[PDB]
Design an enzyme around this catalytic site. Sequence first.
Site, PDB file in Angstrom:
ATOM      1  CG  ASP A   1      21.775 -41.602  78.967  1.00  0.00           C
ATOM      2  OD1 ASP A   1      20.956 -42.318  78.550  1.00  0.00           O
ATOM      3  OD2 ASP A   1      22.688 -42.020  79.946  1.00  0.00           O
TER       4      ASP A   1
ATOM      5  CG  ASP B   1      20.058 -46.321  77.972  1.00  0.00           C
ATOM      6  OD1 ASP B   1      20.551 -45.366  78.073  1.00  0.00           O
ATOM      7  OD2 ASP B   1      20.881 -47.077  78.474  1.00  0.00           O
TER       8      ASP B   1
END
Lengths: 323, 323
Positions: free
Chosen positions: A213, A33
């Site tokens: 992201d 992430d």
Amino acid sequence: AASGVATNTPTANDEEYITPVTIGGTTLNLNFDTGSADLWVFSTELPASQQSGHSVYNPSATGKELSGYTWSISYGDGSSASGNVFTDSVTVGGVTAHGQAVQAAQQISAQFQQDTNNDGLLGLAFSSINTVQPQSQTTFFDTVKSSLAQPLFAVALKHQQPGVYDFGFIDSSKYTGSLTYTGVDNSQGFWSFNVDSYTAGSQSGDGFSGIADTGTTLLLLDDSVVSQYYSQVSGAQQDSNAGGYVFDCSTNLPDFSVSISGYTATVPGSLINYGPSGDGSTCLGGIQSNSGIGFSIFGDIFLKSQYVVFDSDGPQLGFAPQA
Amino acid sequence: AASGVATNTPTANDEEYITPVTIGGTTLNLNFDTGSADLWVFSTELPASQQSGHSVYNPSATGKELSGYTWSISYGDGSSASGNVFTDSVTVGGVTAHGQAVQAAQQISAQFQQDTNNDGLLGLAFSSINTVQPQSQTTFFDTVKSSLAQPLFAVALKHQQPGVYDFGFIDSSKYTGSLTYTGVDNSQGFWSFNVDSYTAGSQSGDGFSGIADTGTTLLLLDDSVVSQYYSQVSGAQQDSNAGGYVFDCSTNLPDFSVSISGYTATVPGSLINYGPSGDGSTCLGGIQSNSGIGFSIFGDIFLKSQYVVFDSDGPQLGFAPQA
Ligand SMILES: COC(=O)[C@H](Cc1ccccc1)OP(=O)([O-])CNC(=O)[C@@H](NC(=O)Cc1cccc2ccccc12)C(C)C
Ligand SMILES: COC(=O)[C@H](Cc1ccccc1)OP(=O)([O-])CNC(=O)[C@@H](NC(=O)Cc1cccc2ccccc12)C(C)C
Ligand SMILES: *[C@H]1O[C@H](CO)[C@@H](O)[C@H](O)[C@@H]1O
Ligand SMILES: *[C@H]1O[C@H](CO)[C@@H](O)[C@H](O)[C@@H]1O
Ligand SMILES: *[C@H]1O[C@H](CO)[C@@H](O)[C@H](O)[C@@H]1O
Ligand SMILES: *[C@H]1O[C@H](CO)[C@@H](O)[C@H](O)[C@@H]1O
């Protein structure tokens, strides 16, 4: 000098991308992430019932405890987790971080208790936002950065096919043409960048900023842009059972593109059809609201169209269409 | 230019120091903590049973919600709290911060549910460690700093008497002699400083670093130093019912001092007698273990002996004996 390649694999509907990570000799499947800076994992400190269906880290076997240290994190989707901290060896794609802080889960919210696809998260945002108290720790990337051939990592996420995370080097066979770079504002700990304009089908508009992201499934944009996009999709409607705008799966979707330092990053309409909405026969849209947060989240739907280089020198982000 | 004085008052045994803070017209009694960077308060979003015995903030009346923002914090003593965020007017000692982020509690751990002395905490550590997601907010001090006559605050905490927080100016009548300054390392978001040596009664030793923390009741030091100190106290022993080393209340305690950039900060033995241990007839010691964290916490026991200036230019800390 070091470098390595870790292979990622999408779960059903590309909801998340998992990559194996070896910690203290035990391999766990983690979600990488770039939107957070904590490396946390399912551990033996969780209730036994919650360890079920996962590979778990046993801190007692190889970890060195940081007495008095804790961590607590909350994600945009509302999930959260908290625990204690140990340092241990962490290997990703053949690259080993010795003394890396591993955050062992002691509590996890329902969302994580339900998701058996992963055994935790490996944060790749800047270390400034790591949650460890009383002293924050560095991410796997920041820990190994100085040993890499080049202080960068790059990612190719794909639709229903394995992809890769390249550490310390750029694989030019993964994209077409040359990379275009743009500067990153890391003041909030994100790989944030500016877009000069966007085109949603037949409508174009002014710029805004957003973050690259890998940890977010969808492309989250301002409500005005979302409205503008779906106004062009025949019969699209919001369905709270599905989580946002849905439409007939056979619908032809417009492309969505953004201009970044002169480069046009285009997400083809086919990638914007995320998959079955899970509510009867409709399909969920890849573009959805960012909840009014004031910046856009360039999630996996967008990343599936590009090869992206996260370069710590600058810092800066490089983009090119995936090959 | 602005400046102001807020009066603090110690609770029983000087366990914590509270100061009134007006938010959206409602005054709440907050614990000022230079060891954290969140301003959070009891609010109407908590279960009604938990609002009992407190003054609470009602965000709906005057606050502007930051949609999608959350906060979650964990303290050294093991307490924690979490919630959502609004901006509102916050006044402290006549100095008003407009648009200040106020973190409304939605959940609070048992420790806070038991403590009716305060209605929340006002963080004064550096803003880099504020917990608000997805974008961190500035502390009250950082918000108003540019409007102050000087970008500093100073504190005089006292034993069983009201004390003060001076904002934007130095009150020379609060200390004897001149201030001695030392540089602050804010890399971890704390007002951290180095001591060159210490003297515990008849034993002296080498230096270490620590943080100036108004939010911690005691002086927390390395176990070796704690042992060295209590080895000199007749009959001192650990009592887990009390929380650490205890001794007969009539015992004569040695002084403890530290050398900081040539200045000797001395905590007299009388201040090291914290108060009744709460376990029969012994007294709890003002010096206790830092739990092996690798740095010292200069809490209220130490602060009661000094007037301390927290100066953002540097940054740096100034010290002089309290008048
Ligand atoms: C830094 O970004 C975050 O923390 C981001 C983005 C964000 C930030 C602030 C507010 C809102 C969102 O949340 P996060 O890291 O929790 C991101 N979570 C997700 O993307 C989860 N995914 C999904 O939940 C799939 C999904 C299904 C249906 C509707 C959705 C509507 C929006 C986003 C995802 C949807 C995980 C299971 C993969
Ligand atoms: C940045 O500092 C903190 O977060 C600090 C220090 C710390 C840090 C890391 C590990 C351990 C401690 O915790 P904190 O902010 O939660 C600090 N809490 C306190 O001082 C609480 N006080 C007390 O709890 C009184 C108290 C009574 C008996 C034994 C004690 C032994 C150690 C400390 C306090 C003791 C609050 C009621 C005032
Ligand atoms: C990544 O790059 C390093 C440094 O050139 C190589 O040694 C490694 O085999 C991989 O190609
Ligand atoms: C993950 O797996 C892919 C394909 O199986 C490889 O290309 C990569 O080197 C890594 O082993
Ligand atoms: C603090 O300092 C300001 C600026 O000098 C004064 O206006 C205020 O009255 C207080 O003395
Ligand atoms: C708090 O109260 C003290 C003493 O009552 C004053 O000195 C200060 O100005 C503030 O009002």
